[PDB]
């Protein structure tokens, strides 16, 4: 697990990680994925190990496809470390820009309510829902109806990145 | 109790946190 100096340097410049951290993450990545290429089954396995009695298939597939920047069916280390940099160390706006890419499942530049429901449902399928009374059931649908309407300031049935990024931000 | 960050489900932050935790497990 020896990363070529130029590569380390470039990945360090492109992320929030120090050169030491990049090399440490590489060493762990190669230990877990000796070929340097994480496939979709291995990615879902990680999440099943987190939630062995939820169903992580949908969430893992959605996130894998966003992480797989060159869409070759594999997460290479450059994709691994850049995905980790943004999702773990980005500013709030950078993290929400990444999430917008995840939620915009058809890549048309907007989040529609069906897309928000797909991600939210995927999250509940994996991690579960909060137990409530049958009369106050924690359904993805009613949660999405609330948040989406709140974000859709111009009520055109679609969310721009601007509308999405302002969703928890206080004014 | 309820997981801390599931209040952000649908806002983007929950998906981001869960994505990061999976990557971290993949590198440890
Ligand atoms: Ca790839
Ligand atoms: Ca869309
Ligand atoms: Cl979310
Ligand atoms: Mg479409
Ligand atoms: Na809108």
Numbering used by the authors:
A (entry chain B): 6 to 176
B (entry chain P): 402 to 429
Question: What's written in the study?
Answer:
Three different peptides were synthesized starting at residue 400 and ending at positions 423 (P1), 429 (P2), and 432 (P3). The crystals obtained with hNCS-1ΔH10/Ric-8A-P2 grew using microseeding techniques in conditions containing 0.5 mM Ca2+, 100 mM Mg2+, and 100 mM Na+ (see Materials and methods section). hNCS-1ΔH10/Ric-8A-P3 crystals grew under similar conditions to those found for Ric-8A-P2. Although Ric-8A-P3 contains three extra residues at its C-terminus no electron density was found for the C-terminal residues P430, E431, and G432 suggesting that they are disordered, exposed to the solvent and do not participate in protein-protein recognition. The structures solved with Ric-8A-P3 (Structures 2 and 3) were virtually identical with the exception that the Mg2+ ion is present only in Structures 1 and 2. The following discussion focuses on Structure 2, which is determined at the highest resolution and statistical quality. We used the best quality data set (Structure 2), in which Ca2+, Na+, and Mg2+ were present in the crystallization solution. The anomalous difference map shows 6σ peaks at EF-2 and EF-3 metal sites while no signal is observed in EF-4, indicating unambiguously the presence of Ca2+ at sites EF-2 and EF-3. EF-4 shows a residual anomalous signal when reducing the σ level, which could indicate a low occupancy of Ca2+ at EF-4, consistent with the observation that a fully saturated NCS-1 does not recognize Ric-8A properly. Taking these observations together, a Na+ ion was modeled at EF-4, since Na+ was present in the crystallization solution, does not scatter X-rays anomalously, and is structurally undistinguishable from Ca2+. We did observe a Mg2+ ion at the surface of the NCS-1, close to EF-3 and located at a special position where atoms from two symmetry-related molecules participate in the coordination sphere.
